[PDB]
Amino acid sequence: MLDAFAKVVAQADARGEFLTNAQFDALSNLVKEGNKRLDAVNRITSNASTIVANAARALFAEQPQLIQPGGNAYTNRRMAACLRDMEIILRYVTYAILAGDSSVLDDRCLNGLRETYQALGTPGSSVAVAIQKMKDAAIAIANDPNGITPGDCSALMSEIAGYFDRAAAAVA
Amino acid sequence: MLDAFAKVVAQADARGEFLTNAQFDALSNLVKEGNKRLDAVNRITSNASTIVANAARALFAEQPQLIQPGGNAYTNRRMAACLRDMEIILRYVTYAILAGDSSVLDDRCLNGLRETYQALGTPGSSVAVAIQKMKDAAIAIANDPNGITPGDCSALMSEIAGYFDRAAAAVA
Amino acid sequence: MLDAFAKVVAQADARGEFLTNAQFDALSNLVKEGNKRLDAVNRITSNASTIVANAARALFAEQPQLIQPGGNAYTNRRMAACLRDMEIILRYVTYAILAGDSSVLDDRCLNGLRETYQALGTPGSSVAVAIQKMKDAAIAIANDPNGITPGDCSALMSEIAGYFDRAAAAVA
Amino acid sequence: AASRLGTSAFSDAPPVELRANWSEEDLETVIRAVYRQVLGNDYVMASERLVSAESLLRNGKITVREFVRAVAKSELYKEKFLYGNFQTRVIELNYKHLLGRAPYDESEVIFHLDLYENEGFDADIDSYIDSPEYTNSFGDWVVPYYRGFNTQPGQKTVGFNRIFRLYRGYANSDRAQAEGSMSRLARDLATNRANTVVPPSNSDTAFAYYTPSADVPPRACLGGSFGESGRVYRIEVAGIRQPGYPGVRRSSTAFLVPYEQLSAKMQQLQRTGARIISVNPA
Amino acid sequence: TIPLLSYAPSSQNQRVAGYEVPNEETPWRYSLEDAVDQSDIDELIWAAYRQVFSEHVVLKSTRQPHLESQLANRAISVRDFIRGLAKSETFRRLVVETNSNYRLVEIALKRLLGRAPYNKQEELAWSIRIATDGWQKFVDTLVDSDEYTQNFGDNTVPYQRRRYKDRPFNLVTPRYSDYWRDKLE
Amino acid sequence: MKTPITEAIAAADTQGRFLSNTELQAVDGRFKRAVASMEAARALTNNAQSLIDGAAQAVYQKFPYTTTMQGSQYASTPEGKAKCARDIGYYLRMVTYCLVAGGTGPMDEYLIAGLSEINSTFDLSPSWYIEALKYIKANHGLTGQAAVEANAYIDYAINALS
Amino acid sequence: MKTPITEAIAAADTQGRFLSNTELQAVDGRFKRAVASMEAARALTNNAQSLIDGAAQAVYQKFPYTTTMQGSQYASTPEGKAKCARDIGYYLRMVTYCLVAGGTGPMDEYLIAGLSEINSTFDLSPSWYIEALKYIKANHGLTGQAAVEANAYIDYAINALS
Amino acid sequence: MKTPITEAIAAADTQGRFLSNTELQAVDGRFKRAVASMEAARALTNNAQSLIDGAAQAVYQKFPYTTTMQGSQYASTPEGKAKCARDIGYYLRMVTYCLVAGGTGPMDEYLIAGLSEINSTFDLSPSWYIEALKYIKANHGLTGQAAVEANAYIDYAINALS
């Protein structure tokens, strides 16, 4: 698991030398916008359950063949597993947001997920659609302008979108 | 393809230094006893067919299971293959004797031999017995003191024995 | 593609009779004059590029129609091709010198060469002039004796001139 | 080299032994970790968890060793792996889940299989649980972890290769894998054959490279090959799909190519879309 | 050194497209891709020998023992086996030494690549390939042409592309033309 | 043909290059050995008449059945004896040609090529030629390095027949 | 490497044939020339430092602009002068390697292997090294057969650079 | 040659399909950009003589040391001056063809192809022409799109020579 600071340190360790002024400025930019990062992760974590539940209802309304008899989201055991996996993707994306780097997202959660779903038979494209539903929901929840001291946050919202996108593309 | 001269050059190139006086002296010794080397190669190649044939007869007399039905040198196609491989080993050993080093022998007929024979089912121990039979026959014909000018040839005889042994050790 | 020894042996094989004493002495004479042949090929090959280039410089000016627009040597590509073919002829002639016969010159070259150029649209007469200019260049460079023990190598020069003439007559 | 190989972070050991063996929170973690390792990261539903074992687990009547054995012999474990797979494959899974390694040689299968044939499965699990390896690497108070990655114990080199066949990623579970329902390390184990390491998928295209040596070139060149200057590099590929004349055939395969031609061959392979698994000198 | 002088292609059966099911005159396709048993591999090896060298000249001394062992252990592709036949010394003695470059282009194209020369201009076009690059490099590019990779993939023995109502190349082309017969009586 | 000179030339032609010093060294060695080679060839050809007849009688002695039991493959008839003389003469003539050429080229092109194919069709046992060539190798009447060259070519033929 | 010995071995290997008398003759010629070759190599390495220093000064005199004109290709700095010495040392070391190998193999494998490509990408001029090799060819201080072979290899390098 | 129209035709022919809208769009782009290129070609042909004269003097001034050394590869003699004028004119004459063809086809067909062997054998340094063509490149008298497209072709040729 690498976070942003750790990522810069690891590159600098590969090249030896000593931390350049540019790298220092980059990390200073990260810390001066840190309060924003923490607020976003707090908002997403606080509504995790409703995000997953709403996205799940939408997925099963849009693609009914999944929950029809004989489909992969049938029999109430596989339904539990599907809800579990949606929540797990959300959890590791939340980890990534707090870290500031997508290394955690690709090192544990997306590490092997593709072949897992390929072997199970679960349609990867549908999982990607579900992740995108969660993407819109979570980004809206975090970008809600009421409830906190106002200020520019669009960069962080785009970063959140980037994490969700990485997961959705890797599953599909 | 590296002969003795090429081997010396390659080591010196790795170091990046001109050949030392010692290396020059070694190669001068090689060339001053070169007639012995090429005479041995000539004698081995002149009796190649008889060498392989006699050694084959001896191998099948010592280990009758090979030529009994079911054994790996049965059905006359595998017998042809066995004779072919014996003469192939003799040919690459002859190359090695002319070159002065075992590089060709270890690169082009010994590299993957063990794995291929293991997969085929060919008994490697029996192949080693066969190549040692060839070793004694070829050593004797090359070392025959009658028919050519007298001299000392013991170093060259030890070298040819070493190469036959190398093949025997790799195949088994 | 034959050599001197092979040429006499081939005629003897057509006749079906053991090599006659006369043929033996002829080949002995050929071996007697081996060193000069080797010297000549060594000297010509060391200066090959310069020989052909120097002759080419003069050729293009003495035959301006070729380098004027609309001529066969015009454009960079066809000029490159003319240089290439001059060097090709020189290479096969050097082959012939070492062989001692013009067999190689007539086998893989000079067998339909005129027809190839005639179909291509190259003027054959100009090619003949080029070959003759090359012939003068080659006879000169081989026949500038200095730096070695002298001899009457005029025979070698005459046979080299014969090879060049054979090519020139075959292309025109 | 961590992320590509798959070992994201397996860099500590979770014991439960404490004055507060429950520790009020740590025991929850230990129970989860045992479920992840013993059941092969299977998603156990809440209703079918082994509540009876956890009762004794917090009480201290049973140690972590006893908890691991209880899960291993409970029908929860049997339904996933034991009943449904070839017996040798089950031996492989036991080695992966209980001792955190892969079979190092055929004698392992011989011994465990004979136990199963005569004594019964319960005795087989018993042998894994109380083998010197389990008693040492783990300690009746330490959840089993994949120690096969680390080489400290003393093991055949092939072990490293072989463990990467069983572990196909952090997300993966052995109930759900590319080659599942059939032996994954059986043909190789009899021949003591090494295996190329197949990296698990990570945000890029994956093509699980099966390596049956039934129809592949040998690991070595076994000749002079083309005879050009330089040795012969063996190039593997999996996803060949573009040039299907009868259907391409043997989509996953290797080619022994002389050095000078490698570049050309490479581009050809890339054109078909197969991602080269390995390029090993032969 | 020079981009090979462009040749004008002529209409031919091989160039044409045709939606035909295989005839009884179909060339027959010897594919080592299936990795057939050793006995069938013998047939495949024999067909390649029959193509690169003619049926007439494939004797014991011509047979390369190494090649026989090559195509038996799922080694270098049938294409590389063909190239090995082509660059072997016996082939150079039998074909290369007995013909001029212009005829060599035709012979090699008919046998190795399996299509007749497009026109006389193409015979000229690849003659220089033989000269500058060397015969070994000429056959290298001949079997490394994009056309070849489409025609016979890798593990398919070369065959006459489609001799539809056409004389087979082997039975219309001798080992060497009458031009070299001047050295014979 | 596989003549040392032509082999060097072909090696240079494969790489499309003017004759390098390596090839020139090789042909120089050929010329240096040619004195002994040509003297050996002269010796063998001027003694050829005795050699051919002696080899014929040698094979008749080693294989008496070849002189008695009837068949076209055998020399039971005077016509067959003529055939035997003709073929052993072919072998001797080829060896002299190879001696003068400096390589195995001549015998490979005029004899060894397809030798196995025809010696089975006409049912000429190779062992007969083997014994004849052994007689010639024992009675060639050469000495020294001349002898070594000639015997090398003879044994090349012997191994090819086998 | 294209050593004469290995060349003969490869020629026999592509045909799967035992070493014939022709190959043995070629290798014998190699060994005959090797006495002079080794003498020449010993001479060149005994004077190695003197030869490289002299060649360095020769190119400094022939091309004075290279010692003043600014540019990475020029030796207007001590490191650049070191690079000049290093490269002429490479050429001399390759010559000694080729002398002991008895062929141009080493020269082709460790040099003359895209020498045009490299000098063009860096834009360094071949003429520099050509003149340096000329000085070495004149100052080698050899006589006899050794002299002719060493100068032949140096000239091989010279014409290969062009 | 490598004309945009011709390249689209070749790409469609190797697939064996009728011209799809992709190829038609490409040729449309060629026609749309053939207004400025043809204007530039007209401009450079109408002032061709003056610009070649200027370029000739430019190369004479940049390389007076070649302008004074006597030889076949130099313009020191009046005959060589005439040759230099004609070859500078050749470069301009090809650039106009390149402008009209809208591609690099003429460049490769009338030059570039085998530039290395020519610049090695005659050793006519490309730098001579390069300096002349840079004079042309600034003094061409085009503007805007015509200028930038012409400059693109010119610098393609310059970087191709090196």
Ligand SMILES: CCC1=C(C)/C(=C/C2=NC(=C\c3[nH]c(/C=C4\NC(=O)[C@H](C)[C@H]4CC)c(C)c3CCC(=O)O)/C(CCC(=O)O)=C2C)NC1=O
């Ligand atoms: C428990 C550890 C901990 C956390 C989590 C934390 C968060 C935190 N982030 C802050 C700043 C901020 N909060 C925002 C919030 C936003 N403005 C917007 O227009 C968006 C709608 C939204 C992005 C989600 C911004 C832009 C700042 C930066 C300005 C500042 O630092 O006061 C502030 C001060 C003012 C505020 O409450 O917003 C706190 C306390 N502080 C902590 O000690």
Ligand SMILES: CCC1=C(C)/C(=C/C2=NC(=C\c3[nH]c(/C=C4\NC(=O)[C@H](C)[C@H]4CC)c(C)c3CCC(=O)O)/C(CCC(=O)O)=C2C)NC1=O
């Ligand atoms: C056709 C190629 C070719 C051959 C074959 C050849 C042979 C050859 N071997 C020689 C020497 C020799 N050969 C031997 C050989 C031996 N001593 C022993 O004890 C062993 C029984 C035997 C090893 C097989 C010795 C000791 C010499 C003399 C010393 C030497 O030069 O190596 C000599 C020099 C002295 C002489 O005339 O005998 C020649 C010419 N020369 C050639 O150009």
Ligand SMILES: CCC1=C(C)/C(=C/C2=NC(=C\c3[nH]c(/C=C4\NC(=O)[C@H](C)[C@H]4CC)c(C)c3CCC(=O)O)/C(CCC(=O)O)=C2C)NC1=O
């Ligand atoms: C077997 C030995 C051998 C020969 C002889 C040979 C010649 C040869 N030269 C050719 C071209 C050519 N040859 C020349 C040569 C000349 N240009 C001139 O101005 C002069 C009149 C003449 C030199 C004196 C030229 C200009 C071309 C190119 C023709 C063109 O593309 O229009 C071609 C046309 C096909 C091609 O370019 O590949 C052949 C076959 N190739 C060979 O392999």
Ligand SMILES: CCC1=C(C)/C(=C/C2=NC(=C\c3[nH]c(/C=C4\NC(=O)[C@H](C)[C@H]4CC)c(C)c3CCC(=O)O)/C(CCC(=O)O)=C2C)NC1=O
């Ligand atoms: C249409 C495309 C085309 C080009 C580009 C071309 C180049 C070209 N330039 C040449 C020569 C030449 N180029 C020069 C040029 C110069 N001398 C100098 O001092 C100057 C610095 C320089 C002017 C920049 C000279 C003097 C020759 C004649 C050399 C000779 O014939 O030996 C030649 C040799 C034959 C001849 O003189 O024409 C060719 C083929 N040929 C072509 O068909």
Ligand SMILES: CCC1=C(C)/C(=C/C2=NC(=C\c3[nH]c(/C=C4\NC(=O)[C@H](C)[C@H]4CC)c(C)c3CCC(=O)O)/C(CCC(=O)O)=C2C)NC1=O
């Ligand atoms: C590696 C290939 C190779 C070369 C290059 C070679 C050259 C060579 N040339 C020689 C001599 C000689 N070369 C000549 C030749 C000539 N007479 C003339 O008028 C002409 C100018 C010239 C013909 C080009 C003569 C007369 C001798 C001295 C006597 C002799 O050796 O026959 C000699 C013997 C004495 C010496 O070393 O000088 C050698 C070794 N030998 C070789 O094995």
Ligand SMILES: CCC1=C(C)/C(=C/C2=NC(=C\c3[nH]c(/C=C4\NC(=O)[C@H](C)[C@H]4CC)c(C)c3CCC(=O)O)/C(CCC(=O)O)=C2C)NC1=O
């Ligand atoms: C053989 C089967 C079996 C039994 C019988 C068993 C008993 C058992 N009950 C326990 C807990 C407990 N059991 C109770 C039970 C009660 N609290 C009350 O107020 C009531 C009077 C009474 C129920 C009628 C409580 C409160 C605990 C929790 C103790 C704690 O964590 O603080 C514990 C402590 C560890 C744990 O919770 O896992 C054990 C071992 N465990 C077993 O595996």
Ligand SMILES: CCC1=C(C)/C(=C/C2=NC(=C\c3[nH]c(/C=C4\NC(=O)[C@H](C)[C@H]4CC)c(C)c3CCC(=O)O)/C(CCC(=O)O)=C2C)NC1=O
């Ligand atoms: C699904 C349950 C299951 C099966 C079926 C199984 C098969 C199996 N049989 C084995 C041995 C064996 N099996 C046989 C079988 C036979 N030999 C013969 O001659 C007969 C034709 C045939 C019996 C009729 C032999 C000879 C061995 C020993 C092989 C050896 O040690 O090399 C082995 C090797 C390891 C060992 O011996 O422990 C396995 C894995 N393993 C399993 O877990």
Ligand SMILES: CCC1=C(C)/C(=C/C2=NC(=C\c3[nH]c(/C=C4\NC(=O)[C@H](C)[C@H]4CC)c(C)c3CCC(=O)O)/C(CCC(=O)O)=C2C)NC1=O
């Ligand atoms: C912590 C990172 C991590 C992930 C992501 C992971 C995935 C994962 N999901 C699984 C199952 C599953 N995954 C799904 C998923 C879905 N089915 C659908 O219809 C939807 C489209 C989709 C949800 C969006 C289902 C239905 C199963 C159960 C299949 C089964 O056990 O039979 C399984 C194995 C079977 C089991 O549950 O025992 C794994 C290993 N494992 C991990 O360790």
Ligand SMILES: CCC1=C(C)/C(=C/C2=NC(=C\c3[nH]c(/C=C4\NC(=O)[C@H](C)[C@H]4CC)c(C)c3CCC(=O)O)/C(CCC(=O)O)=C2C)NC1=O
């Ligand atoms: C003669 C023996 C032979 C076999 C067996 C064979 C199989 C084979 N089927 C293929 C394709 C394929 N095969 C399928 C088959 C299926 N798709 C599905 O959705 C189903 C689950 C399943 C059928 C029920 C598909 C979809 C492809 C295309 C894969 C792709 O383009 O990605 C490919 C990939 C290359 C190609 O399409 O040519 C091979 C090699 N080829 C052969 O030559």
Ligand SMILES: CCC1=C(C)/C(=C/C2=NC(=C\c3[nH]c(/C=C4\NC(=O)[C@H](C)[C@H]4CC)c(C)c3CCC(=O)O)/C(CCC(=O)O)=C2C)NC1=O
């Ligand atoms: C690099 C040069 C080279 C070597 C060395 C080589 C070995 C070799 N020997 C083989 C076959 C064989 N080798 C044997 C050998 C033997 N059987 C016995 O009883 C004996 C003890 C022994 C002879 C000494 C047999 C019986 C086969 C046939 C196996 C088969 O194809 O069924 C095979 C299998 C394919 C083939 O026949 O080509 C290889 C690859 N192949 C090569 O290309």
Ligand SMILES: CCC1=C(C)/C(=C/C2=NC(=C\c3[nH]c(/C=C4\NC(=O)[C@H](C)[C@H]4CC)c(C)c3CCC(=O)O)/C(CCC(=O)O)=C2C)NC1=O
């Ligand atoms: C399948 C149909 C087919 C036929 C008919 C055919 C004929 C044919 N016979 C040939 C050779 C030959 N054909 C003969 C035939 C004879 N010599 C004689 O003395 C007799 C009068 C006659 C036998 C009755 C000979 C001697 C050669 C070899 C010529 C040579 O290489 O010099 C060749 C030369 C090319 C080669 O060797 O492959 C061909 C093409 N080829 C074919 O593919």
Ligand SMILES: CCC1=C(C)/C(=C/C2=NC(=C\c3[nH]c(/C=C4\NC(=O)[C@H](C)[C@H]4CC)c(C)c3CCC(=O)O)/C(CCC(=O)O)=C2C)NC1=O
């Ligand atoms: C120049 C290359 C060349 C060779 C080698 C050659 C050999 C040759 N020997 C033959 C036959 C023969 N050769 C012999 C010779 C012998 N009879 C004996 O008793 C002895 C053991 C033996 C002498 C050593 C006989 C008897 C036949 C006739 C076979 C028959 O009619 O069945 C035949 C069949 C035609 C015929 O009957 O003449 C050929 C072609 N022809 C050639 O062109």
Ligand SMILES: CCC1=C(C)/C(=C/C2=NC(=C\c3[nH]c(/C=C4\NC(=O)[C@H](C)[C@H]4CC)c(C)c3CCC(=O)O)/C(CCC(=O)O)=C2C)NC1=O
């Ligand atoms: C063993 C095979 C081999 C060769 C041939 C070789 C040559 C060689 N010389 C180089 C550079 C160089 N060489 C010089 C040398 C010189 N300075 C001068 O004034 C002289 C005119 C000249 C000596 C003749 C300089 C200055 C550079 C650096 C040029 C640059 O950095 O651009 C470079 C570029 C990489 C580097 O900086 O070293 C190579 C590759 N290196 C090799 O490994």
